[PDB]
């Protein structure tokens, strides 16, 4: 027999209940705007998939952000546009304002509402324990919405989380790897960055779901509260799972491989070897603490599970005692 199928615990049939036009991005007709309504002001940086620019909308004098995408297949740009349009207005999710093509180069470019040029990886060292609790909850707000909209991000990492620390506003960006979730659909395992890949990707289990983002988020919290970036520092894809096994242990990893009947490489089992589960208190040291708390380690333990179905959902995570005072302070201050 082959690999045992899996289903998302929550938001399983959200795309099934919605009409076909919601998730069938291949059938969607992209309505392009005019690039002449936007002028590039300055350069904000460069990514491995695009080049981000600061721009101005000359029709309403509004500041925007233009993302000139590098050449890519036409089905990926339509998927990202449809996902961004379906997530417009969502909390802590970037707001796609327009989509344009160069009149000569014909290369597509995404236009978003203005967000400051400061990501989470640039501030996680200068933030207190409550500030990482607050921003982690804001990330969960954006993850629960897109999951409830039947959309996996599949590239959660500190660089894709923009922070406007003056205004306490957070935005989850880079939706180029996002994909609609459909029960029983096998997805591509070449998603996310190596340090943030879930074990389902490292063992080539293709029927994953929203819970992949929860693992990536678990690696982000572990990197911050322990001040070790990245937390799982694998040098290749095999070593990434080894680095994970040296922390969670090989016992729960093999019981995860046999649970879904995953066929690993015969030499991969000899590479993983046998490792005991290391308690989270062994990475506390003395400087990176004060960011560590019993509810933090318990919250981290419930995110970094081998079994994707055993991880916490974004909603269940938002109700963990790690955010108890955060949700109490948010409900009275805004
Ligand atoms: N899915 C596309 C999200 C938009 N986006 C992508 N890369 C971005 C960078 Br780098 C910066 Br800086 C800013 Br501001 C934004 Br907005 C970015
Ligand atoms: Cl979820």
Report on this structure.
The chain is of the alpha+beta class. The protein folds into two domains: 6-23 and 115-333, Orthogonal Bundle (Transferase(Phosphotransferase), domain 1), CATH 1.10.510.10; 24-114, Phosphorylase Kinase, domain 1. Helix content is 34%, strand content 15%. The protein has a five-stranded antiparallel sheet, covered by helices on one side. The chain has a two-stranded antiparallel sheet with strand order 6-9. It has a two-stranded antiparallel ribbon with strand order 7-8. Helix 4 packs antiparallel against helix 6. The radius of gyration is 20 Å and the shape is globular. The structure holds the ligand NCCCn1cnc2c(Br)c(Br)c(Br)c(Br)c21 and chloride ion. Ligand B0K binds at residues 44-45, 47, 52, 65, 67, 94, 110, 112, 115, 117, 162, 173-175. The PDB classes it as transferase. Keywords: protein kinase CK2 casein kinase 2 ATP-competitive inhibitor 3-aminopropyl-4, 5, 6, 7-tetrabromobenzimidazol, transferase. It forms a monomeric assembly. High salt structure of human protein kinase CK2alpha in complex with 3-aminopropyl-4,5,6,7-tetrabromobenzimidazol. The protein is Casein kinase II subunit alpha.
Q: Which descriptor suits the 3D outline?
A: globular
Can you write the helix and strand succession as a string?
HHEEEHEEHEEEEHHHHHHHH
- Main β-sheet description: 5 strands, antiparallel
> How many domain units?
2
The whole-angstrom Rg is 20 Å
Shape-level CATH architecture of the largest domain: Orthogonal Bundle
| Number of E strands | 9
Q: Approximately what portion of the residues adopt beta-strand conformation? A: 5-15%
Helix run count = 12
């Amino acid at each position: 027999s082959g690999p045992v199928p899996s289903r998302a615990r929550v938001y399983t049939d959200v795309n099934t209940h919605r009409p076909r036009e919601y998730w069938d991005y291949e059938s969607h007709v992209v309505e392009w705007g005019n690039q002449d309504d936007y002028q590039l002001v300055r350069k904000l940086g460069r990514g491995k998939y695009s080049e981000v620019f600061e721009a101005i909308n000359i029709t309403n004098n509004e500041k925007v952000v233009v993302k000139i995408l590098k050449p890519v297949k036409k089905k990926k740009i339509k998927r990202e546009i449809k996902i961004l349009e379906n997530l417009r207005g969502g909390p802590n999710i970037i707001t796609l304002a327009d989509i344009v093509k160069d009149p000569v180069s014909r290369t597509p470019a995404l236009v978003f509402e203005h967000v400051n040029n400061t990501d989470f990886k640039q501030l996680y060292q200068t933030l207190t324990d409550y500030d990482i609790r607050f921003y982690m909850y804001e990330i969960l707000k954006a993850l629960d919405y897109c999951h409830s909209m039947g959309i996996m991000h599949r590239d959660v990492k500190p660089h894709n989380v923009m922070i406007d620390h003056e205004h306490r506003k957070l935005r989850l960006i880079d939706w180029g790897l996002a994909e609609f979730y459909h029960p029983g659909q096998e997805y591509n395992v070449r998603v996310a960055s190596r340090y943030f890949k879930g074990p389902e990707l490292l063992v080539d289990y293709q029927m994953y779901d929203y819970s992949l983002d929860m693992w990536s988020l678990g690696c982000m919290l572990a990197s911050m509260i322990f001040r070790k970036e990245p937390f799982f520092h694998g040098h290749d894809n095999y070593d990434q799972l080894v680095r994970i096994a040296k922390v969670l242990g090989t016992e729960d990893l093999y019981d995860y491989i046999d649970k879904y009947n995953i066929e690993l490489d015969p030499r991969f089992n000899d590479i993983l070897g046998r490792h005991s589960r290391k308690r989270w208190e062994r990475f506390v040291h003395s400087e990176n603490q004060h960011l560590v708390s019993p509810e933090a380690l318990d919250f981290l333990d419930k995110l970094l599970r081998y079994d994707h179905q055993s991880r916490l959902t974004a909603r269940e995570a938002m109700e963990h005692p790690y955010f108890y005072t955060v949700v109490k302070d948010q409900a009275r201050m805004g």
